[PDB]
Design a protein around this ligand. Structure first.
Ligand SMILES: NC(=O)C1=CN([C@@H]2O[C@H](COP(=O)(O)OP(=O)(O)OC[C@H]3O[C@@H](n4cnc5c(N)ncnc54)[C@H](OP(=O)(O)O)[C@@H]3O)[C@@H](O)[C@H]2O)C=CC1
Ligand SMILES: NC(=O)C1=CN([C@@H]2O[C@H](COP(=O)(O)OP(=O)(O)OC[C@H]3O[C@@H](n4cnc5c(N)ncnc54)[C@H](OP(=O)(O)O)[C@@H]3O)[C@@H](O)[C@H]2O)C=CC1
Ligand SMILES: NC(=O)C1=CN([C@@H]2O[C@H](COP(=O)(O)OP(=O)(O)OC[C@H]3O[C@@H](n4cnc5c(N)ncnc54)[C@H](OP(=O)(O)O)[C@@H]3O)[C@@H](O)[C@H]2O)C=CC1
Ligand SMILES: NC(=O)C1=CN([C@@H]2O[C@H](COP(=O)(O)OP(=O)(O)OC[C@H]3O[C@@H](n4cnc5c(N)ncnc54)[C@H](OP(=O)(O)O)[C@@H]3O)[C@@H](O)[C@H]2O)C=CC1
Ligand SMILES: Nc1nc2ccc(C(=O)NCCc3ccc(Cl)cc3)cc2s1
Ligand SMILES: Nc1nc2ccc(C(=O)NCCc3ccc(Cl)cc3)cc2s1
Ligand SMILES: Nc1nc2ccc(C(=O)NCCc3ccc(Cl)cc3)cc2s1
Ligand SMILES: [Cl-]
Lengths: 249, 250, 251, 250
């Protein structure tokens, strides 16, 4: 049988490119989404048109709450009910917006930024391992976590927490033969609505080609980590950032 | 006028050593506690006997919830109410226990306590501290071993990693206000109460420098340095106080 | 035509595994060696019998000296002489032995070999590779996943490997405008020392979380192959640990 | 009597501040110099005038050569000769200039940038340890911007990374002998003399904490901490003193 993968936030952008590349590689895929139902379905139909019964969707909010654990359990369950197995988990979904220290409430900001970026990955990891051959987890990290954007403390805290989870889970799941790694983009798909003049400011900062990563470039690193070529690699985070993190102020 | 400091979890162990040593340096202190009522009030009496009117207690649960922000605001407010100022915040309080990935508390409670005390409360206290705002600074108690974690401590480790991120992000953001933000990262220090002595020595034997744990006073010493005039250009730094433990391979 | 790669210390162990895998991916290869003449020529012979005129050898001491620059220059020239191009440089050659701080070789000689092979020669080879550029160019440095938790009494080796991290970052930054990527691969425990006894080997094996075994040479080569491939076209200044989780294990 | 310290490149700038501060703390000191004999003696004069026979000078080139070992033995020797003991080694001396990948020969650049910055610390460390209750420690002057290097400064960067490696390996290896080994990592301090005045402001404005460079004395403060009894459990730690500069993205 073909292996199966869960990709969170898979409807658009980087998660979309990861789901596609996984599918092309021979995986059956669960496309998780929160709001982008139409995008998620059309991806699934396209993939199912390539190969019948190889893609399903799964809706869930990943914000931190007393139901998040149940939600994460269900995401993993959906892979097993659809495909009879779950070989790969890709923690891709992410909230990202500034939270200055000095119109959502603070507790909502915490729930959203820490929930999506750290806690949901942790709950998904627990459910993935408990329901368990090349098993692996890939967490989407951030190459700029030690040189953060001003006034993004909660986001940055969530991405640091994810690094800790990657390391902690790699150590703890290694006896079960589940590898746990990360991919850390620098600047990738810029917001659609961000002005070209602003996009160019970011672009210019990147040493390797003065451009942002495509979603496919990020996906390429994910494909490597889940592949047979990375069978000894666990607890590693590969930056895919064109040297951006090497550039001083 | 004497400056004032908030120390979280200051009733016992390292937080107490920190509050004691700030006091001895000239600070008025808010001793925050959750459960350790007796010990809290006892320390404040000791300090107040030494110099009257220089110590208060403040009770608060630092578990994440929709009212954690109000509790954090309150801890800071208590310092202004007692002393008219708040110059130093020490984020010391911490929950610490295993949370295995593969199987009495629900997971949602484990998340609330470990991520709340170790990371979210620090963030909220930082926000409140900065909003109410001389040599201002915050010191976060981090963990020297965060990249070589204890097995089955994923949520604790995640909390401490988040605290590093907070240390860096708040140092950057609060620098224009003249608030410095730094960390102190113990290795093995005061060893948990429910621990055997064969097991204590096991851990002691791993430490290159003197084959022993840090005293609480040794941790406090680094806190004292970071808040002092000798650290005025230091921000976003984490000082490991680990006796070389983090350098030892498996 | 087929791209060409230089692999340093490629006669045996991990360098051979890298040269072989680059060859199987369709590269022409320079097999650099120092003392291992028989093993180097034998590997080129194997590779040549597989596709002719696709492998040469190149002898050079990579100890630091006033002639180390010329020697590194000549290694790169060997690739242009044999193949007309040089697309990939793998800095694999490495000296490895204790240098205790509280104490056959003089200390001068220790510094020359451990800092020379592990750091200075990579720098000089990087310079020569970049200067000779007259496509998908990259350099891969063989680093060490355990550089922040070092073996007792290996200060000079550790200093060299840390310098190599510094090179990887500095060269990635400086060479990116020229389209040359520079990355590292950091093994934990892989092929154990020839001179090591089995009992000692198993002590090391038992520390690895993922499988309680060392990395195969092939598993190291796999990451090298990833970094030079078009699947890594936006990756520069990254060091990929291939350590089975060993660097995560506390004392 | 009183403890003794060796500070390398202590004639000027950061090394002088370190020497002066150690002296004020009550150390007797060896002021190492290569070129700056006048400055070295002038500083010795100022310190002996303060406390009689508490400062001596020592000449040595710290370029890498067949004689560096002998030179490093001498520096440590002169401390034992003058003062009968050697409690502290500060590896401060350092060369700094670009070495583009695409004047001096390369091997001179290597000898200076790797030699002075990394090899001489390693040899001084050996001699210091060989010639050994006490509070013995070594402090290495590192660089906070090591992971975000200046364009075309590869050899310099290699040397400072090697210095981190030495700090770690020596902390591990000497911990059994009660010798601590730590680092202090400045960001932008006293800028190069030849550097334009407009170019200097460019850098000052990047620093989060106060849009200014560290004074030499601020660097020295961190050294003082690390050698003090307040850091007796600290080894293998590197303290950044950079005013947050290393946290700022491109
Ligand atoms: N793009 C870049 O330059 C960089 C990206 N990264 C990391 O890469 C990963 C992918 O990046 P990118 O594609 O740009 O991400 P986006 O910001 O586009 O978000 C991806 C998806 O996350 C989902 N998501 C957001 N909030 C929630 C929530 N509360 N519950 C559930 N799902 C939620 C959304 O699903 P839906 O649309 O269905 O609601 C969204 O489509 C992320 O983890 C990100 O942090 C890191 C560095 C830079
Ligand atoms: N001890 C060591 O070896 C090491 C410690 N550290 C770090 O150093 C710091 C101090 O260590 P240590 O003294 O051992 O800490 P403790 O484990 O003794 O805990 C400190 C205090 O935190 C408080 N706390 C726990 N949960 C809560 C909560 N929900 N709400 C409010 N307060 C709470 C408790 O207050 P109360 O008693 O009033 O209930 C407790 O006494 C911690 O942040 C720790 O992570 C780092 C690594 C090594
Ligand atoms: N093996 C492991 O477990 C680990 C390996 N690594 C790194 O991976 C890489 C490959 O490891 P491995 O295959 O074990 O390496 P080896 O120790 O087997 O050395 C590889 C080659 O280095 C060459 N070499 C040594 N000294 C010199 C010199 N003075 N001049 C020129 N060449 C020299 C030798 O060539 P010749 O035989 O022709 O003389 C030798 O075959 C190295 O960079 C190493 O540090 C990192 C951590 C763990
Ligand atoms: N300046 C800054 O802002 C920064 C400082 N640093 C580090 O801080 C430390 C002190 O910096 P700073 O005061 O600017 O250093 P300098 O560049 O001014 O050099 C300090 C001293 O080193 C000595 N020295 C240089 N080359 C040699 C050599 N070949 N042999 C012997 N001695 C030599 C000189 O002594 P003499 O005059 O007697 O010839 C010189 O005065 C260094 O380790 C540096 O790398 C790192 C980051 C930035
Ligand atoms: N889920 C997401 N996580 C991240 C993390 C980083 C970035 C990113 O780098 N975006 C472009 C750079 C940037 C930085 C700051 C702002 Cl205000 C806008 C854009 C974008 C995203 S989207
Ligand atoms: N609030 C606290 N945070 C920490 C962090 C680390 C340690 C520690 O390292 N303790 C000694 C090692 C250890 C680990 C787990 C247990 Cl159950 C006992 C001892 C102890 C504590 S207490
Ligand atoms: N050129 C080489 N560089 C390295 C770097 C590290 C290792 C390694 O970690 N080997 C296994 C551990 C080990 C410990 C002590 C010794 Cl005497 C040998 C091997 C082995 C090698 S071989
Ligand atoms: Cl030369």
């Amino acid at each position: 049988e073909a292996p199966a993968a869960v990709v969170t936030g898979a409807a658009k952008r980087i998660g979309r490119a990861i789901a596609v590349k996984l599918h092309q590689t021979g995986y059956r895929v669960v496309i998780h989404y929160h709001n982008s139902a139409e995008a998620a379905v059309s991806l699934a139909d396209e993939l199912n048109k390539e190969r019948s019964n190889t893609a399903v969707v799964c809706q869930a909010d990943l914000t931190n709450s007393n139901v998040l654990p149940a939600s994460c359990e269900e995401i993993i369950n959906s892979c097993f009910r659809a495909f009879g197995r779950c070989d790969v988990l890709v923690n891709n979904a992410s909230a990202f917006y500034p939270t200055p220290l000095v119109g959502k409430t603070v507790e909502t900001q915490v729930a959203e930024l820490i929930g999506t970026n750290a806690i949901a990955p942790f709950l998904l990891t627990m459910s993935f391992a408990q329901r368990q051959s090349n098993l692996s987890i890939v967490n989407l990290c951030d190459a700029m976590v030690d040189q953060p954007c001003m006034a993004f403390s909660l986001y940055n805290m969530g991405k640091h927490a994810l690094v800790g989870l990657t390391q902690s889970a790699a150590l703890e799941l290694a006896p079960y033969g589940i590898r746990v790694n990360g991919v850390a983009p620098g600047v990738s798909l810029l917001p659609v609505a961000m002005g070209e003049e602003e996009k160019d400011k970011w672009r210019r900062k990147v040493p390797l080609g003065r451009r942002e990563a495509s979603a496919e470039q990020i996906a390429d690193a994910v494909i490597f980590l889940v592949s047979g070529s990375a069978q000894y690699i666990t607890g590693s985070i590969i930056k895919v950032d064109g040297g951006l993190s090497l550039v001083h102020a």
